[PDB]
């Protein structure tokens, strides 16, 4: 490890394991149907996903 | 008792004798021990041990299981003259994986844990079914002769044998791998059965003593001849050879002249008794330089296992035929069977191989059990069955308890 600015890991210490938010960035679905208009199977599928 | 000398296995196979501290905890030794083997490898001019990425160094038994890091070497059952292995175990930590939609999740996971049907397996199944088919054909063809011992049975079976044998011939010449050989071997094994009854079915007139002599003979020859050129499936072929040869002698004697079955059966029992004593010797004589020793060892092991098995079949068949609830001093063969069973049970402990020792041990129990059933079905009575049932259940229960307690 190096302190010379470009090394972003300096001063960081491992304490254990757990949950973290991935590097992916989700785009919201266009033309989303209104709630009474949603088909039941595909709804929970997209929701749980 | 303060220290113990042991052999340590290291990288690529070098075994080194070391004198270790008998009471320090094992985790204290692995570091300097690693330095020592590397230094010796360096002085020897070999390449040292090296780590790869993420992992750790551990001290393990020859079986790979690691020793408990905090316990003393004397606390574990490690003694002077034993041997150990230093090993690198890589890091197994990795992210968890989740699939939420249940149908995709069930298919994905279920596809990694089991094996799907494929063409290699399919061929063996076909071979297995045809083998099962022809043995049924000889069976029905073999039953017809009891009512009409004409030429039909021999004539019909002969062509089938030729046809099956002809196929096995082409397969054997073409085989390239053990998978292919398994297909061919199953086919060949099945060819022996029709030829045997085809020959045995040749002597005309009502069936009896004369027909039997031919059958066991060609059977013995065929099994031996197959082994001679094929050199595979030693156990099954050898077992057939033994029971065939002994039966051939008994059948010949009965055909020539025999006052009673008891006379011949007793002779067979004694022949088997002497063979059980000679058994290990027969196995030993029947069987870069290192390769010669490995091949010979398993061949010997194979012949002995079949040999002990063949004798087992003969003595149980003979003993169950010798004892009888009506013939003469009914108690005499019953006590003789007991003494015979004891001999087999005691001698079985002298063998180290599991299948050899187990097959011998089981042979004694089956003899006892068969006699119990024989004296229960014939000369039947409520007390007799009650007594036999109690004996039949406690006998093995006691055997298990003797081993479990």
Swiss-Prot record, chain A:
It is found in: Cell inner membrane. Disruption phenotype: Mutants are defective in the secretion of EsxN, PPE41 and PE_PGRS proteins. Part of the eccB5-eccC5 operon, which is essential for in vitro growth. Part of the ESX-5 specialized secretion system, which is responsible for the secretion of EsxN and a number of PE_PGRS and PPE proteins, including PPE41. Part of the ESX-5 / type VII secretion system (T7SS), which is composed of cytosolic and membrane components. The ESX-5 membrane complex is composed of EccB5, EccC5, EccD5 and EccE5. This is ESX-5 secretion system protein EccC5. It comes from Mycobacterium tuberculosis (strain ATCC 25618 / H37Rv). The chain holds residues 151 to 199 of 1391 of the full protein.
Curated annotation (Swiss-Prot), chain B:
The chain crosses the membrane at residues 120-140, 152-172, 183-203, 207-227, 233-253, 255-275, 303-323, 326-346, 357-377, 383-403. It is found in: Cell inner membrane. Disruption phenotype: Mutants are defective in the secretion of EsxN, PPE41 and PE_PGRS proteins. Mutant is highly sensitive to detergents and hydrophilic antibiotics such as ampicillin, vancomycin and bacitracin. Virulence is attenuated both in macrophages and in the severe combined immune-deficient mouse infection model. Pfam families: EccD, YukD. The keyword Membrane applies. GO terms for cellular component: plasma membrane. The keyword Membrane applies. It is a multi-pass membrane protein. Keywords: Cell inner membrane, Cell membrane, Membrane, Transmembrane, Transmembrane helix, Transport. Its main location: membrane. NCBIfam families: T7SS_EccD. Part of the ESX-5 specialized secretion system, which is responsible for the secretion of EsxN and a number of PE_PGRS and PPE proteins, including PPE41. Belongs to the EccD/Snm4 family. Was identified as a high-confidence drug target. Part of the ESX-5 / type VII secretion system (T7SS), which is composed of cytosolic and membrane components. The ESX-5 membrane complex is composed of EccB5, EccC5, EccD5 and EccE5. This is ESX-5 secretion system protein EccD5. It comes from Mycobacterium tuberculosis (strain ATCC 25618 / H37Rv). The gene is eccD5.
């Amino acid at each position: 490890r190096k302190p010379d600015g470009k090394d972003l890991n300096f001063g960081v210490v491992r304490v254990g394991v757990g949950m973290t938010r991935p590097e992916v960035t989700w785009g919201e679905p266009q033309n989303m149907p209104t709630d009474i208009e949603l088909e039941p199977v595909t709804g929970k599928a997209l929701q749980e996903f | 008792p303060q220290a113990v000398v042991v052999g340590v296995m290291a990288g690529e196979g070098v075994q080194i004798g070391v004198l270790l501290d008998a009471n320090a905890p094992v985790s204290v030794m692995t570091d300097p021990l690693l330095k020592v083997v590397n230094s010796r490898l360096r002085e020897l001019g070999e390449a040292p041990l090296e780590a790869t990425g993420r992992g750790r160094w551990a001290l393990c038994l020859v079986d790979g299981a690691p020793l408990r890091a905090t316990q003393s070497l004397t606390e574990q059952d490690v003694y002077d003259g034993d041997r150990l292995w230093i090993r690198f175990i890589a890091d197994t930590e990795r992210r968890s994986q989740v699939i939420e939609h249940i149908s995709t999740a069930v298919a994905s996971d279920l596809s990694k844990r089991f094996a799907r049907i494929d063409p290699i397996v399919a061929v063996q199944v076909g071979a297995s079914m045809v083998a099962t088919g022809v043995v049924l054909a000889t069976g029905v063809l073999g039953w017809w002769r009891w009512h009409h011992n004409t030429w039909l049975t021999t004539i019909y079976t002969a062509v089938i044998g030729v046809l099956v044998l002809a196929v096995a011939m082409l397969l054997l010449m073409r085989a390239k791998t053990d998978a292919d050989r398994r297909v061919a071997d199953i086919m060949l094994m099945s060819a022996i059965m029709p030829v045997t009854v085809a020959a045995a079915a040749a002597p005309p007139g009502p069936v009896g003593s004369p027909q039997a002599v031919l059958g066991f003979g060609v059977l013995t020859v065929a099994a031996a001849l197959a082994l001679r050129f094929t050199g595979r499936r030693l156990g099954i072929y050898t077992t057939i050879v033994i029971i065939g040869a002994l039966t051939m002698l008994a059948a010949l004697a009965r055909m020539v002249a025999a006052t009673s079955a008891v006379t011949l059966l007793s002779s067979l029992l004694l022949i088997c008794v002497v063979a059980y004593h000679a058994a290990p010797a027969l196995s030993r004589r029947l069987a870069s330089s290192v390769r010669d020793v490995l091949l010979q060892a398993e061949r010997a092991r194979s012949f002995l296992s079949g040999l002990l098995t063949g004798l087992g079949v003969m003595v149980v068949v003979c003993m169950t035929s010798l004892c009888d609830p009506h013939t003469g001093q009914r108690w005499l063969p019953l006590i003789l069977a007991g003494f015979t069973s004891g001999f087999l049970l005691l001698r079985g402990r002298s063998y180290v191989d599991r299948w050899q020792s187990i097959t011998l041990a089981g042979t004694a129990v089956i003899i006892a059990a068969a006699v119990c059933v024989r004296y229960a079905l014939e000369l039947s009575s409520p007390l007799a069955v009650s007594i036999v049932a109690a004996i039949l259940v406690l006998l093995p229960a006691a055997g298990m308890a003797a081993a479990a307690h």
